[PDB]
Structure formats: structure tokens, C-alpha cells
Design a binder for this molecule. Sequence first.
Ligand SMILES: *[C@@H]1O[C@H](CO)[C@@H](O[C@@H]2O[C@H](CO)[C@@H](O)[C@H](O)[C@H]2NC(C)=O)[C@H](O)[C@H]1NC(C)=O
Ligand SMILES: *[C@@H]1O[C@H](CO)[C@@H](O[C@@H]2O[C@H](CO)[C@@H](O)[C@H](O)[C@H]2NC(C)=O)[C@H](O)[C@H]1NC(C)=O
Ligand SMILES: *[C@@H]1O[C@H](CO)[C@@H](O[C@@H]2O[C@H](CO)[C@@H](O)[C@H](O)[C@H]2NC(C)=O)[C@H](O)[C@H]1NC(C)=O
Ligand SMILES: *[C@@H]1O[C@H](CO)[C@@H](O[C@@H]2O[C@H](CO)[C@@H](O)[C@H](O)[C@H]2NC(C)=O)[C@H](O)[C@H]1NC(C)=O
Ligand SMILES: *[C@@H]1O[C@H](CO)[C@@H](O[C@@H]2O[C@H](CO)[C@@H](O)[C@H](O)[C@H]2NC(C)=O)[C@H](O)[C@H]1NC(C)=O
Ligand SMILES: *[C@@H]1O[C@H](CO)[C@@H](O[C@@H]2O[C@H](CO)[C@@H](O)[C@H](O)[C@H]2NC(C)=O)[C@H](O)[C@H]1NC(C)=O
Ligand SMILES: *[C@@H]1O[C@H](CO)[C@@H](O[C@@H]2O[C@H](CO)[C@@H](O)[C@H](O)[C@H]2NC(C)=O)[C@H](O)[C@H]1NC(C)=O
Ligand SMILES: *[C@@H]1O[C@H](CO)[C@@H](O)[C@H](O)[C@H]1NC(C)=O
Lengths: 35, 197, 133, 270, 50
Amino acid sequence: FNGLTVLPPLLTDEMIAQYTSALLAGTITSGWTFG
Amino acid sequence: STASALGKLQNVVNQNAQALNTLVKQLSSNFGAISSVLNDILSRLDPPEAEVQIDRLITGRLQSLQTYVTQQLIRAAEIRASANLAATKMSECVLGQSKRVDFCGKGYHLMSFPQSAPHGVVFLHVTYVPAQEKNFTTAPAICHDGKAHFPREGVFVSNGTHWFVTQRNFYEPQIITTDNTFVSGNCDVVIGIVNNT
Amino acid sequence: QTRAGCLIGAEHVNNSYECDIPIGAGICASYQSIIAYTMSLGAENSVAYSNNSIAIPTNFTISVTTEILPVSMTKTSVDCTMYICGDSTECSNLLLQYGSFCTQLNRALTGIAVEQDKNTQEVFAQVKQIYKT
Amino acid sequence: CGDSTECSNLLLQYGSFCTQLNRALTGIAVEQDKNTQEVFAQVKQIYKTPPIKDFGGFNFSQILPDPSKPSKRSFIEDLLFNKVTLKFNGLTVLPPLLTDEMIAQYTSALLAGTITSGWTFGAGAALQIPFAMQMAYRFNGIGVTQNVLYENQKLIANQFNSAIGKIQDSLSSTASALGKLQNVVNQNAQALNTLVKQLSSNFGAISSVLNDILSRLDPPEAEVQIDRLITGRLQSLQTYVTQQLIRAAEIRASANLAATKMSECVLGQS
Amino acid sequence: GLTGTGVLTESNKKFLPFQQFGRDIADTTDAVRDPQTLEILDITPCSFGG
Ligand SMILES: *[C@@H]1O[C@H](CO)[C@@H](O[C@@H]2O[C@H](CO)[C@@H](O)[C@H](O)[C@H]2NC(C)=O)[C@H](O)[C@H]1NC(C)=O
Ligand SMILES: *[C@@H]1O[C@H](CO)[C@@H](O[C@@H]2O[C@H](CO)[C@@H](O)[C@H](O)[C@H]2NC(C)=O)[C@H](O)[C@H]1NC(C)=O
Ligand SMILES: *[C@@H]1O[C@H](CO)[C@@H](O[C@@H]2O[C@H](CO)[C@@H](O)[C@H](O)[C@H]2NC(C)=O)[C@H](O)[C@H]1NC(C)=O
Ligand SMILES: *[C@@H]1O[C@H](CO)[C@@H](O[C@@H]2O[C@H](CO)[C@@H](O)[C@H](O)[C@H]2NC(C)=O)[C@H](O)[C@H]1NC(C)=O
Ligand SMILES: *[C@@H]1O[C@H](CO)[C@@H](O[C@@H]2O[C@H](CO)[C@@H](O)[C@H](O)[C@H]2NC(C)=O)[C@H](O)[C@H]1NC(C)=O
Ligand SMILES: *[C@@H]1O[C@H](CO)[C@@H](O[C@@H]2O[C@H](CO)[C@@H](O)[C@H](O)[C@H]2NC(C)=O)[C@H](O)[C@H]1NC(C)=O
Ligand SMILES: *[C@@H]1O[C@H](CO)[C@@H](O[C@@H]2O[C@H](CO)[C@@H](O)[C@H](O)[C@H]2NC(C)=O)[C@H](O)[C@H]1NC(C)=O
Ligand SMILES: *[C@@H]1O[C@H](CO)[C@@H](O)[C@H](O)[C@H]1NC(C)=O
């Protein structure tokens, strides 16, 4: 390249998957109360 | 099995790649100078015209960079609006049950589940859809003993010989009783009232 | 000859189907050879209205549908002095007389990247704890 | 360039600006078509009102389609269409994908569906229901018991009818009530007009027409003059494209709001 | 001395006896008067498109 760079995102996809898993477990177990 | 269902993320990636590709391809233009490579201009001629050639190159490349930056700003604003909409949907249709119609799903909303995607989110909406309809005859109120009766909740229906009260979204007939109906006035001003017990 | 211009290589038919490849003025074409036709809005029915008739469902179904939304894009950075000069002292000196036209670009790009990070973090970080099934 | 070989040859060395300009314009047009289709294509079938119309005393004559006129538009739609007022130099205007008749058909289908089936047709199959009972449900939905409606039917109907007539007059006599659409049309026309007007500028050259420059000087300085003209015109085109992009973004936001309102208020009670 | 391309047709405009050519708006010529016959013509750009 000639001065063009791509910066990695702060949140890696593993943490995003972890957030999705936490949200889904919460909504399955506790209904809407945890919100 | 079926592909090409994720056209939005593909479009975003393609637009970014195309913008970068045209930006890097713009480096191979003369812009009215004698060459497109600066080293040849530096090594082929005496400076007092080298600054002229380099000036032409500089102004062309500056124009290209400015155009790229403006396009990036526009696209970023659009993506930010989309992200705000996605955040609102996640807050409303996942952490609770939504009443605003067609906001998330086609039908009556029950719940939603989120899933990740390389540059976005995917919502799975679960909805309830009625089916297998049937005709019935209906009346607005019931006149009995000179009094008008209206249902607390539901609707009066008749299969042809007898009358029942049912909930609106599911057929479940029941005998009309003084517990699921309430009285108001006399059967003289209601248009379409019928006689029953 | 259509309201959108002229078309060669396709046959005009009297039917009307859904629209595959939009053409314009309410007409579009599809492959069968290639046929061009007037677009069809949908099916046709007349609900049997009456002043003492009702319809009530007797059964139900449960449907699962999908929705897709982008939230972020790649974060990019560009260096002016290497893009337009390519490590040349004379080019740098010549560019130095154009004022500060590139600090602005760097600020804009950094703002874009920070905005992307904020977008992702605000969409996904909706909970305070991590629950386990 | 205006069909000049020298201008094309000189322009050939500025890269590929025109490809991305045309790409942006094509994207804008596609977005416009998508906006219209998303806003209006909300139903799956085309419902029709019954030939006999007795909606408990309510009167929808002013808004139902009129078969007499070929356009099949209603009174209010014709008033709105008559209210507003509005290939030259290498620029073209493309026709929309959806004709006005199709928009009117969608509007008529939505109106018939909401008149006959209540809000059910927006969540599955349209379900028949008498209008008075639907209005009783709508009162029951705002915390007022249905008891009221059946005991005040005729009066209520009268009020509704009167209100409808009033707005017709408010549209027939009073003007300047549709400033937004007129403003959009005026903005587009003015932008196109000034873009065309920019052709007569000088930009520091000796003349504003290429033929005089070509037929009055030898090439060595003709190139300089043509370069000045070319860069000026290119800058004007870029400015026009950027303004169009901004206006398109704003229009898209407005269209999204309109689609949300149509989904939430016409197909259901909010 | 006024040069340009297009298709020339007959026009019904009434040039007042001293004008030579007419333009409508945005400074684009629409009509001309030939110096010999002294009649008003009409100019239309010949067709183009993508
Ligand atoms: C309407 O519903 C009523 C109540 O279910 C039906 O009356 C019953 O009909 C069955 C079948 O003929 C008899 O075995 C029961 O003894 C009836 N019950 C009573 C209380 O009389 C009635 O037949 C239905 N009418 C129609 C046209 O389907
Ligand atoms: C529903 O509509 C029907 C029309 O089909 C009404 O029946 C009419 O009622 C009037 C007044 O009793 C009679 O003069 C007509 O002869 C009837 N027409 C027919 C075809 O029978 C009926 O009254 C309406 N019911 C309600 C509740 O509005
Ligand atoms: C419901 O029942 C009432 C009374 O049982 C009916 O009212 C009678 O109507 C007849 C004919 O119009 C009159 O001759 C009587 O004087 C009325 N009696 C009373 C007490 O008002 C009423 O008509 C019935 N409903 C229907 C639709 O027939
Ligand atoms: C309900 O009653 C109607 C009226 O008898 C039945 O007939 C339908 O009527 C509409 C309009 O009059 C037509 O478009 C349909 O094709 C008719 N259906 C037939 C003839 O089978 C109707 O079928 C009944 N059932 C439902 C679910 O509407
Ligand atoms: C409501 O719909 C469901 C699904 O269409 C019906 O369940 C089916 O019943 C038939 C007949 O017994 C079976 O052959 C199918 O296997 C059932 N489907 C499933 C998914 O189990 C149900 O019978 C319907 N309800 C009524 C009252 O008819
Ligand atoms: C609904 O309102 C319209 C007015 O917009 C009524 O149409 C009028 O009807 C009367 C009597 O038939 C005529 O003298 C008028 O000339 C009509 N007005 C127009 C503009 O045509 C219509 O009658 C009303 N509906 C009902 C059932 O009365
Ligand atoms: C220019 O010269 C031509 C030719 O002499 C003139 O055309 C003549 O006009 C008269 C008047 O109507 C006719 O009777 C002749 O038949 C025409 N001759 C030809 C050859 O066309 C024209 O009028 C002159 N115009 C001016 C302004 O002097
Ligand atoms: C079928 O289309 C042809 C033109 O393609 C037309 O001449 C003819 O009238 C049409 N027939 C019917 C029944 O519409």
C-alpha cells in the first residue's frame, strides 16, 4: 500500500458472541425482568 | 441452502472496497504533467520546472483525496443512522414485548432473538398468525327484559340457532350470562339490537 | 417502443407477472427468451362486507422471520505526506505552502473510526452482567 | 466538452471522475425508487369496496375512488394534484418506476382494507366486521367504554361528515398549505437551472465558448484556455453532485418517517 | 457568426423587426433569423441518450 491502513476494531468478535449469548440466556431464563 | 440473502453487508463491503480501489487507481494519472511518477520528474530535469510539474501532481491528488473524504463522511452518517435504528430495535423487541404494529415482525409480536454478523446484527422474530376463519352472524347488544346488555370483553356471535360470547382472536363460544355482560339503559336507541335471553 | 425509450431483443406479452428486472414506467422484463410486460401489483379479491356478518379465526400458526441490520464499517487511515509525495523532500516543501489541508483530513478520519467503535459498543453492550444457561 | 475532439483528448488525462459521478447519481435514483416502493407497497392483495355502501351513517364519498374520471382518483387527490405547480444540454430526467395509477391503486386498496376489515388485514387475512362495531372497539381502546358509541351514533357520524367537508374547503380555497412539496420541486428546478447557467462563465479565460478559442489562437495557449474552462466546469459539476447527495439523504430520512407513520397509524391504532 | 449544432425547423414566433436571434432562459439559443430570407427558424438538439 501507499499510506492506506486498516485499524482493527476494539471489540473482537468473541466478545460480541459473548454479549449475544448473555442476552439470549437472560431473555430465555428471566423473561423481560432482567431488562 | 439459499444464498444472497445478506445483500446489505455485502453492499457495504463492496462500496468500501470500490472507494479504496478507485482512490489507489487515481495515482496513475498525468494531470497535465510530463509523467505520472515523481522520481522520473525529479531525475530527468532541472528544478525550476520540476516545481511546476510537482504542483500539477499535488493539486490533482489533493482533489482526489478531498472527494474520497467527503464520500466517507456521507457513508458514515448513513451507517450511524442505521446503527441507531438497530439499537432501538434491540432495546425494544428483545428486552420486552412490543405493541407498535409491524415494528419487528409481521403479525403479533411474541419475542425476538439476536445473532451476530461480521458487520451487523440479525433478529429472529417470533409471531402469532391466525388462520382457518369462519363466518358468523353478529349483533351489537342484547335486549332482555327491556334492558340492553353489552359484553365485558369479546363479541356476540350465532351459529344459526343460539347465541354465544367469544374472545375476538380465537373461537371459543360460551353461554351468555350476567357475569360476562353489563347493562346500560333500555333497548330503544341501539341500532341493530336483537332479542334473546 | 415504451414510455422509457425503445427496447430491442424482447417480446411484449399481454399477461402480467411480478417484476424481476425493473425497466420503468410500470413495465419490466424477465427470462422465460426474454419477455417484457406490465408489472402486476398483486392478487385481486373482494371482502364480503355486510352489516351483520363477522369472521373469527379458529386456528393459529407461529412464524419465525429474519431481519438484518448493519451497524459498523471498516476503520481506515490515510497519510497525506506518503500518499501525495512518496518520501520526497521537494514535494514536502512544496506542499508546506498549502496550509493545513491534511490535519483536517486526519481529524475527520479519526472521528469516523471513533464513531464506528461507539456504534458497535452502544448497539451490543446492553447488559451489565453475563448470564449463563 | 460539447463534442470537441481537443477537449476530449485533454480531459482524458484527468482519470475517472465521471465514472464515480455517474455511480453516485445512479445510487441516488435507485434509492428514490426504493423509498417509494417501501412507503407505498404495504399490502399483499388488492381489496375492493362492496358496490353497496352503508357504513352505519358514515360517508366516505370524498375519499373513495371515482370511476367517472379516467385517473380513478378521488376528490381530495384531484384537488391536491391540481394545487401544486411546476434532454437540454447533456442532462436527462428518468421516469419513476411506479406510475400514478399504481400509487392510486395502492391507496385505494389500503383504504378499502381499513374500512372493511379493521386492523386485521395488516396481520394476516382480512376479516369482515361491521363498521360500527369497529368504531366501538376503537373507543374501547382509548379508555372509553363502548356503551357511549351505540348511544351517540348518529350525532358522532354527523360530526365526522362535517369535519370531512371542512378540510375540502380548507384545501379548495386556502392555498400555501402544501409548502413542502412545492419547496422540494423549486429546489430541484433551481439547482438544475443554475447548473445549466454556469456554462456561460469565463473562469479567467478569454471567452466562454470553445469554438472562438479554437478559431482564434494556435494550440500552445489554446490548451491553457481549455484547461481553465475544463477545471471550472468540473468544479461546478462536483458541487452540484454534492448538493444532490445531501438533499437525497434528507429526503430518505423523511421517507423513512413517512413509512413508519403509515405502518403504525393506518394499519393499527397507536 | 453564431455557430452550433442541431435540427432546424419552422417556427411561429414573431421576432420584433430588429432582433436577430432569441434565447429563452439560462442563455440558450432557440430561434434564429436567416440574413437572406428574413424568416424565423427553430433549433432543437438532435437526439441522444444512454
Ligand atoms: C349451534 O350450536 C348449538 C349448541 O352447540 C347446537 O345445539 C346442539 O346441537 C347438537 C347437534 O344437533 C345437539 O346434539 C345438541 O343437543 C344441541 N344442544 C342444544 C342445547 O340444543 C346447534 O345444533 C348448532 N346449530 C347449527 C346450525 O350448527
Ligand atoms: C343491514 O342491511 C340490510 C340491507 O340488506 C337491512 O335490511 C333492510 O332493513 C330495512 C329496515 O328494516 C328494510 O326496509 C329493508 O327492506 C331491508 N332490506 C333487505 C334487503 O332486507 C338491515 O336492516 C340492516 N341492519 C342493520 C342492523 O343495519
Ligand atoms: C323483542 O321483544 C319485544 C317484546 O317482547 C318486541 O316488542 C314488541 O313488538 C311488537 C311489534 O313491533 C309490538 O306489537 C309490541 O307492543 C312490542 N312489545 C313491547 C313490550 O315493546 C320486539 O319487537 C322484539 N324484537 C323484534 C326484533 O321483534
Ligand atoms: C362468508 O359468506 C359469504 C357470503 O355468502 C361467502 O361467499 C363469498 O362472497 C364473496 C363476496 O360476496 C366472494 O368473493 C366469495 O367468493 C364467496 N365465497 C364463496 C362463494 O365460497 C363466503 O364464502 C363465506 N365464507 C368466508 C370465509 O368468507
Ligand atoms: C390447527 O393446525 C394444526 C397444524 O396445521 C393442526 O394440527 C395438524 O392436525 C392434523 C390432523 O390431526 C395432523 O395430521 C397434523 O400432523 C397436525 N399438524 C401438526 C404440526 O401437528 C390442527 O389439527 C389444527 N386445529 C384444528 C382444530 O383443526
Ligand atoms: C355523501 O356526501 C356526498 C357529498 O360529497 C353526497 O353527495 C351529494 O348528494 C346529494 C343528494 O344525492 C346531491 O344533491 C349532491 O349534489 C351530492 N354532492 C356531490 C358533490 O355530488 C352523498 O349523497 C352523501 N352520501 C349519502 C349516502 O347521502
Ligand atoms: C437577398 O437576395 C435574394 C435573391 O435576390 C432575395 O430573394 C428574392 O426576394 C424577392 C422578394 O420576395 C423574390 O421576388 C425573389 O424571387 C427572390 N429571389 C430569390 C433568388 O430567392 C432576397 O429578398 C434578398 N434579401 C435581402 C434582405 O436583400
Ligand atoms: C396481445 O398483444 C398484442 C400486441 O403484442 C395486441 O395486439 C393484442 O391486442 C393483445 N391481445 C389481447 C387479448 O389483449
